[PDB]
Ligand binder design. Structure first.
Ligand SMILES: *C(=O)[C@H](C[C@@H]1CCNC1=O)NC(=O)[C@H](CC(C)C)NC(=O)OC[C@@H]1C[C@H]1c1cccc(Cl)c1
Ligand SMILES: *C(=O)[C@H](C[C@@H]1CCNC1=O)NC(=O)[C@H](CC(C)C)NC(=O)OC[C@@H]1C[C@H]1c1cccc(Cl)c1
Lengths: 293, 293
């Protein structure tokens, strides 16, 4: 389940530089987009964005909203490029730019040529990648949350990695993780499973009649001793306190759910399926499951 | 991946009758919603909707859009209830009502109290149910597709079944399947796996670098002989011709993909994961995978 995308649909524009075309985010009087739009096929291997953008002018940028906006000011903030435009977006929602932490989730509005094509939910993996579904032209698509009536933009897509996962920036242009916007092989750290998310998932299962996996018990230090072997993030007390409301709503002590999870990690699922999935899902946060109680 | 929901967000309204509150679809000058909104706690067991609606008037219906619309005409079409209102929705998109066939997919905009809360993609199971995620108040939420700029509404949610799956109507009020809008135990036929969808899924996998499952061959009659044992829909020639474009784009003869699938159904996946899933997914149509090439 992903957030409703209407508020974000009204902010997607088509940006063009040379032959390269990608998507931009038109908020107020500014269009944000990845800076590698100013790149050619040869520049992409190791571009000097300073010297490249220097050779560009406002009239070299063709923003097309549904209309053809006129640029009147351009700068480069980190790995994102900011177009000042004459018109201010009338569909501008209440927004803010936020840099999310690993383990948090968000909805992605996948766009091509400035037109929305689909929406799905992702997670910021511990290694600062995301397992998305992006094709060529998808660059400029943004990830976002919606709290109250405020759109918190947290991601802008830039590139794919040799392993097929994806990397990008916040809306200030700073990459998540150890990545740079050039067409070179870049490795991501060994991924880890978001343990607190798997617990919230098991809770969502119990809420939905799935209880075959409930059992024993364990201590926080004990479970974490088991979890560190399966590349599972260590479960702190903050994680426990985050899962508090789910424990209260269901009546299962957090550590008892942990013990059930340790049983799964050791003895496996044995073919059965939890929530209609044969694997342990870790892209649902406790706050997410609470929003779908 | 689900369709962008902005066009549908602007059509969701809150409908109230007595204490019951559910969602409605405000198109032109009409608000569509499930008719069991006119029910009380006692009526839900075996309501006589004729006699119940007869005891209702226009002023008993409180439609609240974001605003409180006034009703000036009401009728009952099958299991849906139609409110004529004074105002016509200015956000009305280009739409049409369509009754979809089993195996086809669509996006659901889950709403509560008339407010959009999330969007996800579903399939019309062969037994005319859907494996959704609906809570109380979700009734009135609609399923839809978007072709060009035209919203094809195909589903309106009504109830949950003893097994946890979900049932509803088209936008004319006719239930999908053998269901009636009363609070009684109702069984659905034995479900089947949408074979052509699983093949399109395996194609999407090959397109995305997953090739460990490719192999032999078989005839259409042979594979179907294997498939009928695993509650898999028989694969006709129309199914083959539907998967044609995916075969051309990937260069794998349809029947060779079928042989690979027969290998999976017999010898299982053996722990490996296709597209990051430990089960064979059947809620992706060939047209869907083409839209995400
Ligand atoms: C923009 O739409 C596009 C999105 C990519 C296209 C393919 N799937 C996507 O998500 N992004 C780029 O083209 C981007 C631009 C650069 C300036 C960063 N480059 C890119 O994504 O190509 C990365 C290929 C995998 C990397 C690679 C490099 C060396 C060796 C190997 Cl094995 C892989
Ligand atoms: C409307 O929001 C609501 C949505 C349901 C609520 C729970 N999850 C949903 O999707 N729909 C209803 O309340 C609906 C109204 C009737 C007039 C159809 N009734 C309903 O969904 O309850 C069905 C319960 C499962 C059936 C049942 C009956 C007898 C025995 C057993 Cl085991 C189950």
């Amino acid at each position: 389940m992903a957030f409703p995308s209407g508020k974000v649909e009204g902010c997607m524009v088509q940006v063009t530089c040379g032959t390269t075309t990608l998507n931009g985010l038109w908020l107020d009087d500014v269009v944000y987009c990845p800076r590698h739009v100013i790149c050619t096929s040869e520049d992409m291997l190791n571009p000097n964005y300073e010297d490249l953008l220097i050779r560009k002018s406002n009239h070299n940028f063709l923003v097309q909203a549904g209309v053809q906006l006129r640029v009147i000011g351009h700068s480069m903030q980190n790995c994102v490029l900011k177009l000042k435009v004459d018109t201010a977006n009338p569909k501008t929602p209440k927004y803010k730019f936020v840099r999310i932490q690993p383990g948090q989730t968000f909805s992605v509005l996948a766009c091509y040529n400035g037109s929305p094509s689909g929406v799905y939910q992702c997670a910021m993996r511990p290694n600062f990648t995301i397992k998305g579904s992006f094709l060529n032209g998808s660059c400029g698509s943004v990830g976002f949350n919606i709290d109250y009536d405020c759109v918190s933009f947290c991601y802008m897509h830039h590139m794919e990695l040799p392993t097929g996962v994806h990397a990008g920036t916040d809306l200030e242009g700073n990459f998540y993780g150890p990545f740079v916007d050039r067409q070179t092989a870049q490795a991501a750290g060994t991924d880890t499973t978001i343990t607190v998310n798997v617990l919230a998932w098991l809770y969502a299962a119990v809420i939905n009649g799935d209880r075959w996996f409930l059992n024993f018990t364990t201590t926080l230090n004990d479970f974490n001793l088991v979890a560190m072997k399966y590349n599972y993030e260590p479960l702190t007390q903050d994680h426990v306190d985050i899962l508090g409301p789910l424990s209260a709503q269901t009546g299962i002590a957090v550590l008892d759910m942990c013990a059930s999870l340790k049983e799964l990690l050791q003895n496996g699922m044995n073919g059965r399926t939890i929530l209609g999935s044969a694997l342990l899902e870790d892209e649902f946060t406790p706050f997410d499951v609470v929003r779908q109680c």
